Structure formats: C-alpha cells, structure tokens
Amino acid sequence: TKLLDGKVAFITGSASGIGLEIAKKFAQEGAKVVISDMNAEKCQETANSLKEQGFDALSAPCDVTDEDAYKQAIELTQKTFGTVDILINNAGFQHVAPIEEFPTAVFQKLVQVMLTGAFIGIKHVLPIMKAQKYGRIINMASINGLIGFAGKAGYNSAKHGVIGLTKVAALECARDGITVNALCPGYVDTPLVRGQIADLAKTRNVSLDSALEDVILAMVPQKRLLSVEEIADYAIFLASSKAGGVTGQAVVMDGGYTAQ
Amino acid sequence: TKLLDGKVAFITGSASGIGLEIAKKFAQEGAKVVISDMNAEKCQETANSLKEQGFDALSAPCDVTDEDAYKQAIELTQKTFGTVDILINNAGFQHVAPIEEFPTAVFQKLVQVMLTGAFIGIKHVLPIMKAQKYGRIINMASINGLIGFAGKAGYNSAKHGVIGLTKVAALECARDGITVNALCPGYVDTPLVRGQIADLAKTRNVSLDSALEDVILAMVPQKRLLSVEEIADYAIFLASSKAGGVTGQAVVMDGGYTAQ
Amino acid sequence: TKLLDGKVAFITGSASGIGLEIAKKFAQEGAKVVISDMNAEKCQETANSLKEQGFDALSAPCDVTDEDAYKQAIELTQKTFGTVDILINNAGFQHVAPIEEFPTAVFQKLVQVMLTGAFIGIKHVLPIMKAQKYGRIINMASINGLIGFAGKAGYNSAKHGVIGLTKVAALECARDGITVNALCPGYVDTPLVRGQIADLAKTRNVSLDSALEDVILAMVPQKRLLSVEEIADYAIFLASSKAGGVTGQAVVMDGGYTAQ
Amino acid sequence: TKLLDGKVAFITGSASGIGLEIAKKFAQEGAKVVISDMNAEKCQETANSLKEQGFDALSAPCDVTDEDAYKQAIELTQKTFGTVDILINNAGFQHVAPIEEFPTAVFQKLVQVMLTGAFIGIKHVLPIMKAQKYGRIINMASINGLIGFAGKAGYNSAKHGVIGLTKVAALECARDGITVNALCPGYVDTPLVRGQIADLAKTRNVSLDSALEDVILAMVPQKRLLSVEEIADYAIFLASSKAGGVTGQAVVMDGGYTAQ
Ligand SMILES: NC(=O)c1ccc[n+]([C@@H]2O[C@H](COP(=O)([O-])OP(=O)(O)OC[C@H]3O[C@@H](n4cnc5c(N)ncnc54)[C@H](O)[C@@H]3O)[C@@H](O)[C@H]2O)c1
Ligand SMILES: NC(=O)c1ccc[n+]([C@@H]2O[C@H](COP(=O)([O-])OP(=O)(O)OC[C@H]3O[C@@H](n4cnc5c(N)ncnc54)[C@H](O)[C@@H]3O)[C@@H](O)[C@H]2O)c1
Ligand SMILES: NC(=O)c1ccc[n+]([C@@H]2O[C@H](COP(=O)([O-])OP(=O)(O)OC[C@H]3O[C@@H](n4cnc5c(N)ncnc54)[C@H](O)[C@@H]3O)[C@@H](O)[C@H]2O)c1
Ligand SMILES: NC(=O)c1ccc[n+]([C@@H]2O[C@H](COP(=O)([O-])OP(=O)(O)OC[C@H]3O[C@@H](n4cnc5c(N)ncnc54)[C@H](O)[C@@H]3O)[C@@H](O)[C@H]2O)c1
Prior knowledge:
Chains A, B, C, D: It holds the Pfam family adh_short_C2. The structure is a homotetramer of 260-residue chains. Chain A has 260 residues and is of the alpha/beta class. In chain A, 47% of the residues lie in helices and 13% in strands. The first copy, chain A, has one domain (1-260). Chain A has a seven-stranded parallel sheet, with helices on both faces. Residues 12-13, 15-19, 37-39, 63-65, 90-93, 113-114, 140, 142, 185, 187-188, 190-193 of chain D line the site of one nicotinamide-adenine-dinucleotide (NAD). One nicotinamide-adenine-dinucleotide binds at residues 12-13, 15-19, 37-39, 63-65, 90-93, 113-114, 140, 142, 185, 187-188, 190-193 of chain C.
C-alpha cells in the first residue's frame, strides 16, 4: 500500500542524512517530494535520480534562513504539484563548545536555521493547508529539545524552541485538518554522527568502536544508533492520514535515552 | 501488506471498545490475537467471529488482578501459538468522585486493575520475550497519566503509575529486543464515553450534543472524539518491527489536549 | 523569623531521615509538629525530646495503610492543636529487584504505603483544610516519580502515582486556599541511602567511597548527596504562607539528575 | 534574617514589574542590587530611591541584545561591588498575533531579547562565578516555556528555548557551586498584564473584571493573578545559599495552570 498516495511533501535539508531518507521513503509511499537544501547541485542530482526511478521529484533549493527564497520554493511547489500537504522542517547543523567559548554569532545562527527556519516554513504553508483543510507539519527536533547536554547551548536552545513553536502552531490550526508535531530522534547513524565519532576517536586517542560504544551510546539504553530508515518510518506514520489525532507532540524515538 | 504477520498478540480487556478494535485490526495485519476479558462469553463469541472471518483467534478469559488466571491465559497462549510477541495491557474502568467521597476500596481497585494488572502481565511475558530476544509491550494509559483531572483520584493515580512501570520495564529489557511504551489517548468514541455523555446530559439537563461539545470536548483543541480505529493504527505502528527504537515513552494521541 | 508560626504540621514516617529533619526544622519555624510512624517508641522519644527543647510536639503513631489508625491520629491532632494546616506524606520504603523476581505482594505494598497512604491522609485532612480555607499538602515523591530506574518497578510506579494524585488533589482544592505539591528529591544522605551504599560496597567488593562516587552519584551532575537540611528547607518554603501560588507541581531538588 | 546578605544581584529589565519587585525584595534580604533596563532614567531614579532607603544599589542600564553594553554593565558591577553572585535574566516583552500575520522580524526580536539576551548574560557571568565557585542564575521564563498558547509563536518559542539554555548551562557548572534554574510564573498582576486586560476589555466590549475573570483566568485553577511579591519570594529561595541542590529546573508558580 502507498500511505502518502499523491500527497505533496516539501522537505528542508533533504540533500543528505535523515531528510534524504525521508524524501526517498516518502516517494516509495506515493508522495510527490520536493528536495530542498543549500547545495543546489546535490538537489538537482537527488531529484533527477528519484525521477529515473519513476518517482515525482522537484528540486527547489533554498537557505531556510532566506524567507524570500523559502517563500519562492513553496510557490514553485504549488506551481509544479498544485499544493503542499506535508512540510518537514529538517534543515540543521551542530556546533559543540562550552558556553564561555560559544561565539554569540554561532548561537544566533543555530537558532535562526533550526527555529526561525521552521517558523518561516510554517508561516508560508499554513495558508495553503488551511484553504484545503488538510496538512501535516513535522519539525525535526531531537531529545536535545527535551533534555540538557553540556556544550550544546545553541542546539538545545533551538530544539527546545522548535517544540514550543510546534505546540503554538498546533493550537492555531487544530480545527483546520492540520497537525503540527516535533519528531525527537536520539543518535542516528548519519554522516553528521559518524563525523562526530571520528572527531571523538582522534581527540581521545581511542578506536571509532570505543568512541561510539563508550561515549555516544553511554546513555542509550538500547546501546545502538537508530537507522535513518527508523526515523523515516515514524515520519511516514505522522505524515499519513492515519495520524490526524496526533498534534502538538514531541514524538520521541531515542532507544530509551529520555526514560532515565 | 501485513505489518504484524504471524506475530502473537495477547490483549487484556479485548471484549469491547479500544481492545476489541485493536484485536480486530491486529488480525487484519496478520497477528494471531488472544481475546481476554472478565466476560468469558463475549470472549468465545469474539474469537469465534474472528475465526469465521479466517483469522487466528484464541479465547483466554481472565481477571488481570488474578495472577494465577493471568499466568494460565499466557501459558494457554504459548501452548496454542508457540509464544507471545505482543502484550497490550488495556483492561480498565472508571469511577469519578471528589476525593472526600472516593471510597478507598475503589481507589485501590482502580490501581489493582490498571497498574498491578499491567505489572502481572509484564512479569509473566518478559521471560518468553527475553528468551526470543523480541517483544512489544503497550500499556494503555491516558492523557490522565500525564495531567490532573478533578474527580479522578484513582484513575489518574493508576495511569500515572503505569507510565512509571513502563519506563522501569523499558530500561530492564532495552538490550533484549523488547520495547515497553504507554499509549496515551484523549477522549475516544467508545461505549465507556457515550455512557459518560449520557450521564452528563441527564445530570445537567442538556442534550447529548451539548454534553459532548461544551463539557467533554471543552479542552480538546480538535473538538472531536478520536475513533478506536485511530488508537488501533498507532498501536499497530508501536507493536510493529518498524518501531524497535521507540521505548520507555508515553506516546500521546489526544487531538492536542496536552499541548495547552 | 518563624515562617510556620503556630501552624499545625502532621508528618508521616517522621521517626527517622527526611521526616525527622522536617519535624525538627518545622518546629524551629514555630510549627506544632505531629511525629507519626510505625515505631510508636521512637515517636514518643522524638516528641519528648522536642518538648524538652521547648517545642510543641505530639506523638500520634500510625501505619499509613491503616485508614482507621490514620483517621484517629488526625482526630488526636485536631483535639490536641485545634486543626491540621500542613500534611507531609513522607512514609515510605524500598525493594530493588528485576521485575521477573519482584514479588507481586511487595509491588502492591510499596504502592499501598506510598500512594494509597498519601490518598488516605489527603481524604481525611481535606475537610479540616477546606473548612478553614487554608492548607499545605506535600507528598514526598522522588525523581523516580518523573523518570525510570531498572529494579524499582514498585517504587517508581508508586512515586509516579503520587504525582498523579498530587495534580488531581490540587485541582479539587485550588479555590479553597489549599496547595498540593510533590517534593521530588534526588539521592539524600539518609540512613536509607548509607545502607544502600553499604549494600553495593559488599556485593561489588569496592569501598563505600567508590560505591557512592562511581555507582549512586554516577548520574548526579553535582556529584554529591543532598542533606536532609536541604529537603527540609524546600519543604518549609512550600509549606509556608509565601508559597500559596505553587500547586499541582512535581517540585525537583536533585542536583541536576533530571536535567540530562 | 537576611537570606541574601552581601550577595551581589544583577537583574535585567528591573525598572518595572517583576524585576523591580525582585530588586526591591533582594535589597530587603541584604543583596547589593544592580538596576538594569532600556530606560536609563528610570534606572538612576530606581537605584537612587533604594540608596535613600539605606540599600546598596547601582544603576547599570543596558539593552540585553547589545553584548558590548551588557558586558560593560557586568564589569561596572565587578568594579562597584567586587563580584556577581546572582544574575536574574528578566528582560522581556510580548507580541500576540496569528502565525500568518506574525512579522518574522518581531519573532526574531522576541527570541533575541529573551533567549539570546539570557545566553549573553550567562556567558559573561560564568567566569566570575566559576572563579569564586559560587553563583545563582535565574532565567525568568513562563508556563509558556512548558505549554503552547495560540498567538504566541515568538514568546513561547523564546521561553521554551531559555529552558533548554537553563539545562545546558546547569550541566556545564554543576561542579562549580553554581545553579541555573528557570522560574516559570503564570499570570502575574503587572503593568504588562493590566494593559492586556484593558486590551481584551476594549476589543470584546466587556468590563475589565469579565476580561480578567472569564478570559485570562479561564485556565487558572486558583482563579487569581499572582502578586509580584510571590514571584520575588520564590526568586529569593532559588537565589539563596539554601537552594544549592536545585539546578537545571523549570520551577513553576502558576496557580495550577500546568497541572491540567
Ligand atoms: N543525526 C542525528 O543523530 C540527529 C539526532 C537528533 C536530531 N537530528 C536533527 O535531524 C535533522 C537532520 O540531521 P542529519 O543528521 O540528517 O544531518 P545534517 O544536519 O548533516 O543534514 C541536514 C541538512 O540541512 C542542510 N542545511 C543546513 N543549514 C541549512 C539552511 N540554512 N538551509 C537549508 N538547508 C540547510 C545541510 O546542508 C544538510 O544537508 C537536523 O535538524 C538535526 O538537528 C539529528
Ligand atoms: N475511552 C477513552 O476515551 C479512553 C481514554 C484514555 C484511555 N483509555 C483507556 O483505554 C483502555 C480501554 O478503555 P475502553 O474505553 O475501550 O473501555 P472499557 O474500559 O469499557 O473496556 C475495557 C475492558 O476491560 C475489561 N475489564 C475491566 N476490568 C477488568 C479486569 N479486572 N480484568 C480483565 N478485564 C477487565 C472490561 O470488561 C472491558 O471490556 C482502558 O485502560 C482505559 O482506561 C480510554
Ligand atoms: N533518601 C533518599 O535519597 C530519597 C530520595 C527520594 C525520595 N525519598 C522519599 O522520601 C521519604 C523519606 O525517606 P527517608 O530516606 O527519610 O527514609 P525512610 O524511608 O527510612 O524513612 C521513612 C519512614 O517511614 C516509616 N514507614 C514505613 N512504612 C510506613 C507505614 N506503612 N506507615 C508509617 N510509617 C511508615 C519508616 O519507619 C521510616 O521511619 C520516602 O517517601 C522516600 O521514598 C527518599
Ligand atoms: N507578567 C506576567 O504575567 C508574566 C508571566 C510569565 C512570565 N513573565 C516574564 O517575566 C519577565 C518580567 O515581565 P514583567 O511582567 O515584569 O514586565 P515587562 O516585560 O514590562 O518588564 C520587563 C522589563 O524588560 C525591559 N526590557 C525589554 N526589552 C529589553 C531589552 N532588550 N534589554 C533590557 N531591558 C529590556 C522593559 O523595559 C521592562 O522594564 C519577562 O521575561 C516576562 O516574559 C511575565
């Protein structure tokens, strides 16, 4: 069966990692998918490969902090596919430092990409969704939106913020056939994380295996990275017509991290 | 596709309402389902109808407060189907009173059915699941496990308690291929609730429609009862092989109740 | 100054540990204190020493699971001091086991002492407090009321439950000048805990110091036991006329345990 | 007794409302208080009146979004009083609009004042506090940091964010004698709120009394505004040497709003 059959899905940061898998898996479920990221070359390359596999894919690159460019990617989507049924605000990045050595500019940029970016997306899709009395907004948050972690002042601040935006947005459209949720993964096996494992391995003079098993997974009860496939599967449920009563939630898939 | 293909699902309180729909929908997803409740007559009638529709159904009635009878229903399941892959602790009931007029016996019985009952189920399935390094335990909790509501001393106490049991159980089996989650519905269109709408309509001398729209749905942003179909659909996801990284969570489907 | 000047404080489990310090410190703040516990000999000894220090102390021993004896301790308080302004539900105990080896009787008893006990206390003081349009109820919960911990099925279930009872009770008396809060300590330097340090030291063949510093404080950011003095100081604030707008809260003092 | 005796308290937004009361009440508890706000004239006027009442008060005006001016107010404090023991990040404002009509600039400014402002304060006091192995940081958040409210996209996003910053900061200094908490008031009787009552009274053609009792207090179980005195009293406890084991918490004083 095709759980997202001829729905139109716009996914920010979809040229790598969780967003790329979400785009791929949404297409397999019958979605028309919009590949959007900074790297406009990976975006065409991505959408072009999905088209060769017989999928409906549009390249609509944009910096989510650039409201003019984000608004025009949304208009190109409307022009191309007729609507936006599903928005995934996934674009993000990381900077780990103690607060004293945390550049204020970088704090502000993490917040601008991962909070203000989601707010821009939502502001511009809410009209399209309210008109059709249907939609699904998923803000890719993190357990770091629900707990503290030393060195992640900007990230945890931005992810905490996007859960607040999620609840406010959910209340504003609860009557309009529209859900607004924050999907909160724990550690996922992504380019992002294998880099951070490499990072920790160099600096602590340990093997990639120890770096992963003794540091990163130290506080994960299941002692494993989640697969992008697992995040994508939860995204499909939340993005589907079957999840219309789920709204204003921080939805957690963290191998038990936050249960302790 | 059949998301629960030849999994064995044991569901407490499955002769009516959410448990009956879960049993029906789990069967459509290829589960072998065990109908278990107080009313042993409805249990045979239920399982007999599922068998006539070409489903694999066992009647294993028991009072979940009766640990001998619960343990024997689990053994009859093992004998019949070879294992238990999925436990749904769904059995429950309600008594609304101000604390001063809340009989202590009734407080204790709500807790015994809806907390101690879940603990008995889990204690007896954990061996079977740990041996096979696979399982799914879903404790049917409520938003009343996450918030207060005047008049529900025993219910809210028991539902809060089963979320605590959920987290403890999740941590004890996180390495064993086993997930333990609490599904937290808001108001569902059930025999239970249509009765409580009738109740409120008599006592306040209003129509069933006002009783529903002005009292019960007063604090539901979506202003609607959830369908048993919606709870069942979330239960299928959480009970499926696709949700192996979801554990120790209060998973909320409440039309936005708890977002405000 | 005397923050509890001629208030009447009834404290369950007040013959040792946190309850004994609360009784002592409440007396220093001008409270009339009721010492209540299982050990009726320690209760007279306690109250007799407070009297010799020029304090107003009553011995009213009772098992909090014995509703007849709890109701009569409350009546003896009314007879002796004229009212109950402050109830501290502190009585408790611990049994750590994996769920499979967790006797159901012991699960039920942890819940009966630490949930049903608090409900009995509240049921019997709510009339006295509602009549006078004043009161303070503090349920001694734990971080284990807010998170999971492996081996604590009964404890975490009971503490989770008493936070639910707290919210329900708070909503029932929010107009009556009455607050209902759950004080949630982390690890406190108590007879209870020094025993559990001794326990862990024997079984793991390590020093008391390693047992404390490497096991118990492993997940405490501040890397220290809290003093009974610290819990008592928060109890005084919450029990004082200054905290009338604090109600229905899990109030956490855990050296940062739950922030991660 | 003087609970803050010769502690040095720097309070942002302290020329009106909660910050002004905190400054006044901290002075009565023996603090040396720094009055800091946009209005540099109210700041001198404030500090000058505290000096005439025999208090230790410094006027150090600054825009908390201006990191150069905030850093220099902190240096003037060090020069004047020798240290900073207590930081209250209180500066804030409100803009209520549906997301579609919510100017992105205004979203960004609410976040810059109430999140980035707190991060600037913390970055610059953490060195002073870590050197002396003592401090207290209180971020004035709101229940709107813990729940959703329609029309408050920027506010709820910023307040949610500052709770995240609170937990991260708490973990970074848990060993250094420093606590970081977010005080979360409900509706307080402030210039801010009496304005919003006037606002609602005009627009809905109702009396100030109905506007307050039927709209604002609709979801407050205690059906009353909190006094600035009540927030100040909790701030004193959290800012005192008695609260050293409280850290990384959203500390709620909301007349029961969030318990339902
Ligand atoms: N990987 C994990 O373990 C993990 C855990 C929790 C949550 N998350 C969150 O999930 C999301 C996906 O992360 P990921 O691990 O797939 O990797 P990633 O962050 O490398 O991928 C995100 C994509 O966002 C793009 N991007 C960055 N800034 C952008 C901007 N301003 N505008 C447009 N695109 C921009 C990047 O180019 C990248 O391709 C992020 O929001 C992340 O914070 C990740
Ligand atoms: N209906 C709602 O709106 C709602 C909302 C939140 C959560 N819930 C929870 O979901 C579950 C299902 O409730 P429901 O609305 O389908 O109706 P229900 O409570 O009428 O059905 C539950 C079943 O449990 C059975 N049962 C009761 N005590 C039992 C015992 N000791 N042993 C065995 N079986 C027993 C009953 O006979 C009944 O058939 C309950 O746990 C309820 O608390 C319901
Ligand atoms: N010590 C800690 O680190 C810690 C941490 C979190 C919360 N708590 C909670 O704080 C409370 C105080 O614990 P504590 O460490 O002071 O020690 P404790 O549990 O040894 O003291 C509690 C007292 O309760 C009494 N008691 C037990 N069962 C009773 C019953 N049925 N009726 C009456 N009295 C009974 C005991 O005799 C004892 O004197 C408990 O509720 C505990 O669960 C303790
Ligand atoms: N009043 C309530 O009911 C309530 C409820 C929850 C939380 N809060 C929070 O408590 C705090 C105090 O609010 P309040 O009601 O006393 O009123 P307020 O917001 O009017 O007072 C805050 C002060 O901050 C100052 N300020 C604003 N922007 C500034 C900037 N960039 N730099 C420096 N100073 C600046 C203002 O001039 C003002 O004097 C705020 O953070 C508010 O969000 C208030």
